[PDB]
Amino acid sequence: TSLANKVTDMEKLAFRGEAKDTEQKMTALNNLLVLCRESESGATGVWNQGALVPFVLNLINDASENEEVTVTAIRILDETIKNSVRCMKFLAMHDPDGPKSVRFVCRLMCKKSTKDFVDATGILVQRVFNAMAKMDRQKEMKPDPEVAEANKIWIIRVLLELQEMLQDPKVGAVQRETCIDLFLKNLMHMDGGIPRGWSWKFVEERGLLALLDVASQIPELCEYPVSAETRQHVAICLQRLEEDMVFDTKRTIFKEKVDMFFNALISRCTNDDEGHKYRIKLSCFLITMLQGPVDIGINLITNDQLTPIMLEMAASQDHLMQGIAAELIVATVSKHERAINMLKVGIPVLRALYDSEDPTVKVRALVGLCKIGVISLAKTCKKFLLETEKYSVDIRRYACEGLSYLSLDADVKEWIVDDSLLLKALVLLAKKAGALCVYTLATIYANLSNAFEKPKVDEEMVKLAQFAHVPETHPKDTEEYVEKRVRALVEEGAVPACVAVSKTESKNALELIARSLLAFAEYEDLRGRIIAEGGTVLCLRLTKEASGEGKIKAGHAIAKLGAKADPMISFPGQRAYEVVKPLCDLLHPDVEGKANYDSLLTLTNLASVSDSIRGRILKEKAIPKIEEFWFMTDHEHLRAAAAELLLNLLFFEKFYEETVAPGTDRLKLWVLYSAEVEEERLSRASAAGFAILTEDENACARIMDEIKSWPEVFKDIAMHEDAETQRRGLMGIANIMHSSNKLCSEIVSSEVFRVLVAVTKLXXXXXXXXXXXXXX
Template sequence: MPFQGLILIGQADPKLRPFIYQPMTGHGAMSSQFIFLFFARTANHVWARTYSHAPTGQLVPKLWPFIYQTNDRLKNILQVLGTVPELSDALPLTDDTRMTASVLTSKLYDDLRCDSERENFSKICEEYITCNLPANSSGNLHAIHVISGLLQGPFDVGNRLLNLNGVMQNMITLSASEKELEQIVAVEALILAAAKASHANFITTNGVSLLKDIYKGARSEAVMIRALVGLCKLGSAGGTDYSMRQFAEGSTGKLAKQCRKWLCNTALDSRTRRWAVEGLAYLALDADVKEELVQDGPVLQAMLELSQTSDKTVLYAVVSTLVHCTNSYEQKEHPPEMVELAKCTKQHIPEEHPKDKKEFVVSRVKKLLQAGVVSALVCMVKSDSAVLTDACKELMSRIFLALVEDVCNRGTVVAEGGGKALIPLALGGTDTGRTKAAQALAKIAITADPRIAFPGERVYEVVRPLVALLDPEKSALQNFETLMALTNLASISDGLRKKIVKEKAVPAIENYMFEEHEQIRQAATECMCNLVLHSQVQELFVADGNDRLKLLVLYSGEEDEALARAASGALAMLTASRVELFCHPIGVRGLAIVLNLMNAGKDLAECLVASNLVEILSHLAHLDSCDPERKRVTDAAQACLSKAMDYGLIKPYSYKDGSTLQD
């Protein structure tokens, strides 16, 4: 998976120019690819976007000497993270810059290869925070803003900084300030800090009443919405567990109603409306809130339109809300035995909300499709922004998989460009995200014509993620759906069959032909039936020293009709394309068996003649018999045909060479 770096393009302090352009060489780094760390000091604008370069783990030896071992360059990144735009000495940044810098710190931290390097990273951040905390009011704001940025990037580092002496107390104190800016910065930090259970408990104990007072007494909507989101996050601490509600009955609904009201208010600035989406993302863990949200058309429309604006920092909140509405988040299944054991030991058992049952989820998905969620997701995938992180892509993949779960919805997803959008999601991102996207592609390829779902050359791009899904570590359903999708693709053209072979799918498909699961074995055999039309696959079957042909013959006699049909179909195509198969001893013996069946009686002979076996025998009987091996084949075939003529099942026909066969 490529490492996602950052380009910040603008005007820089002359002191920073020596490390603006540093070529990456050695340790597997790709040639002609570079890192740009270019922070605005006097510019009016900063543009940010992602840049792919060396794989994770290969970048550190060249990257870190330029980041933190010389002139404390990591602190320059922290300075951007801590920038409060409203202050007079703030750097001139765009709305996306801080989030982009958070993504950068996250990628840099993830790329570290040992504990000592991670410890060094954390210590630099700690020193930076402790130097600013005892300072004046603006210094406190700067330090807390840095922690907020790190909580959105390398969370472990941000969480460690929260444990520093006085940090949490400072946040609580500033949130009670009469100054609007201090309240905004502190409440934002409290919202992010509440992700950790220990800190959430601290905030619940010390800050809930304060957040309520801020919400009720705030003079500006900017402060009010942040306090509301803080309450929303604390209220969702129980997750999807119906029995762990944090607030009184009806309180969550009131919070959601206010969030929806602000979201629909187009007179508010995009940042305030973005916070409204954040609040809904937390509250949407409650099934009552999900139901109200999907039934409110204007709110859905406003949320999807907001995701297509220039402010891409709202993307994660939007897709999180959609994941909760579609119930596509990771759900743990509790075996009945474990549930009974928990009851006996009086342990807490998570309780499912009545409105999270399958029929409610199906209904919500249909309403989201009607609201145009697919078009919105397609636009999100296309957005060129560092904010579109791998975690965000994974959530999109989950949503797409939930949308195509119902066969009836797949046509809508394809018509609105969902098939095209899934391909990049299946090729990049987290392992889970790629798996979910590939499974969604498989579901589409099973029921829709791949030439329509993935028009033009795009159909070839679908093969690689599908082949990657053929893995014993994946679920049986994922492997089964992948095999069926590849079967459909292999039936389209020889070019696609060649692509499947090139991606080394044949060994995996052969492996699944031995699977104990009947449906998987059948799907693998059907896929191989279509692949044998390709010459390279045929070579595998005609090569000496393998039992592939024997396996097909064996499966042709299985009681499972679908399996026998697939295996016999593969045999029919192989024997039609590769006559030399009959020159093999097993081919001669097969003809001997056919002759014995003919001799057994007219009824059996009629069954054989009714099949396409006569055409094969006719072709074999007229082969060039100069080769002794081939002569045995032609003699056996002619004997079978002669017996059929004796029964009057076929009529004689004279070739130019004088040989007589059926009409």
């Protein structure tokens, strides 16, 4: 009950009214947040047989309450409901009836409208999917199809609630975006979500049609709160659904639903004033197509009825319809040349739309010209981006899109870096617009470190063509120029712009960020600074929630950050514990990036702090991964780092005894690696670990009987070239004869006895041998 008394103290100071100051209540909250996050017993005591949730719910219903206080209560509650027992008890505890308690939890995001509150409520619904299917996107934990169908009736209640909230006009835009992010993360089994057939039921049901209505929206024309940030949340989850319809029976069915939606819209494309807005919703739809499931929409681009309606709304006198046509046709330009089958005619059209002076039309007319790139267009975007107070963030998003399309040229990149106040504009963009511009800003960082071509898989064949005068390499992609670009970007703060746009799910763009971060951590002087701005929080979240292709680079960037770092400053606690899972999955010897040595140096720094660090590594089946690098003969950086890792990992009690255990043949290599003693890197480890292993008597007996031809090894480490390897080894031999006298009896009768007595007459092993002599 000392637990039960220490939750009573923090209980009165949070809920039962013991506070004459806000920050001391914040102190009790931050104490409980640490307290529940440290043990499961914290989540037991704070639960208090369910006494927690009503205190919190009467806290949320304050209009006078600070933001960070309430969000702190949620940061406790979602940690509380990580138990599957407690969360399922929580789910229906808000109504004797089932589905109204379901809707009461789903409408918890509509209490307030700050971005932080809505992102933490989406963590609350996330932990529910983690309670039902027993799945985890954070720990790559697959669901159990046993327990999914065991409580299917709860799930259908939830899906109805969500597809109710998607067309519920009483719900604001930032919350509706967060619902869509829950469909992206937790639904798809291709993304490790709800299993097969579930998404087939959703398509067979009317929820897909709700999403198609949502893609046909804008903040300017809506029936319900939509922001411009919403569409990029829609288009990804639509492409992820296309990634989840694995059978061509179902892709047949998917094309069959969406054509009914489309042809109903074109049945409603009339010239009437009612009929204009269906043309505008078609324009909002097709751009949402091209941003995501590019594949289906081009099959609808070949429909030839489209482009005269594009001309009608361009000749219309409403400027909203013309600005939306500009951003339509600029999304039409693809990497498929049959888009030009529609696009070959509209080339001068936007060339005319720049001539109009409406700026909302103008910046959308500026992009695309940026796509087909000529340095004067960069001079023009220069004009829009530097103007901050006058222009809105909705306009200044499009200039970033135009400049990312301009950043394909190598020579314009240098003109970009020569500006500093541009970057001042970039940080004041990302920290004011938040996560609004992620595809494009990451597209720029990829172009700056040349991270698109960072898959240099084709350069191996290009130099095979050079094995046979004609081509043109370009000098602005030389390693020194990129070192200039990158040191300029780190000097003017790319990292806080990265974490402010990190609140999305865009694996296209989150790939582009990981690729840029990997080139950023190439140099050691700035990576401590990158860590100083929270880059570790960023990279770990990246390797948890990016594209699977980007996770290799994400963990590799994590590996470069912590190579020779002090891990206590660079990784506090919970941040350190989750480090093990990503990089142990990167150790594939058949891959062999220059990541493996970075991996092992990181882990060896990690293994020196605490037992909970090094214990969680063995659970990850790291040991068979480390042994194969430790079996290698050719490499030098790898095997000694695996040895120094395995040097530090013998502090763990159980691993110390797994090596002494009779099933393994590892103690052979701990001494034979002191014998092939051409180098000092591996010999120093295999003699220090030997000095640790031989303090145990049963470990000494397994040396002699299990090693044929052993005194040859000991005479080699006695008549020894290096001095440090030899002196560590001799104390690990000194404790042998201290242990058992029958083994020491097999030492005087052996060959090595004469060189042992030879060395004592010359440093530290001298009195070790003298101690050995006392046995007789």
